Amino acid sequence: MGLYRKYIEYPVLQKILIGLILGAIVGLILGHYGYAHAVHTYVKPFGDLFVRLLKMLVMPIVFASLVVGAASISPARLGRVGVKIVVYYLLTSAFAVTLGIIMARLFNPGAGPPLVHILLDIVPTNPFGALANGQVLPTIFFAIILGIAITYLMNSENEKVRKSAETLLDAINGLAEAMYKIVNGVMQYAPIGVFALIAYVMAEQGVHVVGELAKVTAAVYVGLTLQILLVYFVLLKIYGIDPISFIKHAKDAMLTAFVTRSSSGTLPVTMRVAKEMGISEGIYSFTLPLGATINMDGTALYQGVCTFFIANALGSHLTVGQQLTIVLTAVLASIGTAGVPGAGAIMLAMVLHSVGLPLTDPNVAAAYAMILGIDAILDMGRTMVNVTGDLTGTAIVAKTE
Ligand SMILES: N[C@@H](CC(=O)O)C(=O)O
């Protein structure tokens, strides 16, 4: 076709980066000349199509890949990896949100759920209904249950049941391997989408990011970088794995999660960098699709610093906010959020409705609107630390096995 084949000749991460750079440059130039409605009605629909594709991909890829993932064995490896991976994700997410409580105290703010039905909603009251209407967490539950039942059926004695279980597992594996090819097809289109998205985001609200609300995003970025270098480095340093080689060996997945702003949009490159890391296929194949959508350390560290930006601009106080329930509801919102770009803001609204200062006041929508505008640049570092937390967990359970 001509220049199209040269466009599918470049490597991907030497192209999404040039899209981000030439999006931020043209966004700043068109923000210095006041073309904000021009970008918002001409260039932003490409980024909205990109976000539409990354939302489309998440629901088959969290079901079929997770059913295939729960086919190592039923008892031993699955049980031990399950317990020592969910408690690992819980401690990493809780340490991230208590770092967020630690943050915005050395840093500054910017001036200018019935508590058991949330856990009972994990069990889906209808599996196809909880697969249609979003609901990533009950889809995860039903997918793990179906995987365990399929790996029980494959060890049966009747030949017809064995053939039927093998055919069902091969069908779901065909869907889970077709969704990765659709991910590759989307991430070929990705530089146009990230160009449009960062162009609009730098144009509309990002023109004054460094003037005011610079200390909140400085708090987010310094907290995420210190989260990396003070949790993941020490967790690789406990179990005897050199972590600078871990960054230089997983920088592929780190960078594509940094630019595409989706944890579940970087699942194939995270799987290929685990195999290029050589973790082992049977030991990552369950915990990477689980960890892609059950632990988000970026949103966990992000909800605390967002609630401290809102509550310390014009809010009640910090100890009247009762930070322990902020930690708990932020861990729950990190667990229950999806892997799309603009996901954690809605769960942040859920956190604020659940802990205090709900979204009805005339001085809470004005603080939330600025962070809804600036959410798109924080999503980058959020998904970056999420995918490298997944990779860190896979390397840890590679060590203790
Ligand atoms: N972008 C995050 C969610 C968020 O921070 O809004 C994810 O893909 O999981």
User: Domain-by-domain residue ranges, the chain?
Assistant: 12-401
> Under 8 Å CB-to-CB from 174, ≥6 apart: which residues?
none
Using the mean position of ligand 1's atoms as its centre, give its distance from the Cα of residue 234 in Å.
25
**Cβ of 263 less than 6 Å from ligand 1:** yes
Q: Is the CB of 383 under 6 A from ligand 1?
A: yes
Kindly state if the Cβ of 223 falls inside 6 Å of ligand 1.
no
The answer to whether 264 and 339 are in contact (CB under 8 A) is yes
Ligand 1: does its nearest atom lie under 6 Å from the Cβ of 343?
yes
**What is the CA angle 173-178-181, rounded to 5?**
135
- Burial-class residue 227 by CB neighbours within 10 Å (0-12, 13-18, 19+): buried
**Ligand 1 atom closest to the CA of 347, numbered from 1:** 6
Give 371 Cα–ligand 1 centroid separation in angstroms.
14
**What is the number of other CB atoms lying within 10 angstroms of the CB of residue 145?**
15
- For ligand 1, whether the C-beta of 384 sits within 6 Å is no
Q: Is the distance from the beta carbon of residue 55 to the nearest atom of ligand 1 less than 6 Å?
A: no
What are the residues whose beta carbons fall under 8 Å from the beta carbon of 382, sequence distance 6 or more? 224, 261, 296, 298, 299, 301, 302, 344
Distance from the Cα of residue 329 to its chain's centroid: 17
Q: Report the distance separating Cα 93 and Cα 329, nearest Å.
A: 11
Q: Is 64 exposed, middle or buried (0-12, 13-18, 19+ CB in 10 A)?
A: buried
Cα 29 to the center of its chain, rounded Å: 30
Which among 62, 93, 262, 296 is the best mutation to test ligand 1's pocket, defined by most ligand atoms within 8 Å of the CB? 296
Buried b / exposed e along 358-397 (16+ C-beta atoms within 10 A): eeeeeebeebbebbeebbbbbbbbbbbbbbbbbbbbbbbb
Ligand 1 within 6 A of CB of 298? yes
Distance 298 CA to ligand 1 centre (A): 7
Q: Does domain 12-401 have CATH number 1.10.3260.10?
A: no
Q: Is the CB of 292 under 6 A from ligand 1?
A: no
In the PDB record, what is the listed experimental method?
A: cryo-EM
Closest residue to atom 5 of ligand 1, CA basis = 344
SS (H, E, C) the chain: CCHHHHHCCCCHHHCHHHHHHHHHHHHHHHHCCCCHHHHHHHCHHHHHHHHHHHHHCHHHHHHHHHHHHCCCCCCHHHHHHHHHHHHHHHHHHHHHHHHHHHCCCCCCCCCCCCCCHHHHCCCCCCHHHHHHCCCHHHHHHHHHHHHHHHHHHCCCCCHHHHHHHHHHHHHHHHHHHHHHHHHHHHHHHHHHHHHHHHHHHHHHCHHHCCCCCHHHHHHHHHHHHHHHHHHHHHHHHHCCCCHHHHHHHHHHHHHHHHHHCCCCCCHHHHHHHHHHHCCCHHHHCCHHHHHHHHCCHHHHHHHHHHHHHHHCCCCCCCCCCCHHHHHHHHHHHHHCCCCCCCCHHHHHHHHHHHHCCCCCCCCCHHHHHHHHHHHHHHHHHHHHHHHHHHHHHHHHHHHCC
Could you tell me which residues come within 8 angstroms of residue 163 by beta carbon, excluding any fewer than 6 positions away?
none
* Nearest of 80, 83, 81, 68 to residue 150 by alpha carbon: 68
On whether the CB atoms of residues 202 and 36 are closer than 8 A, the answer is no
Q: Which residue's alpha carbon is at the smallest distance from atom 4 of ligand 1? A: 344
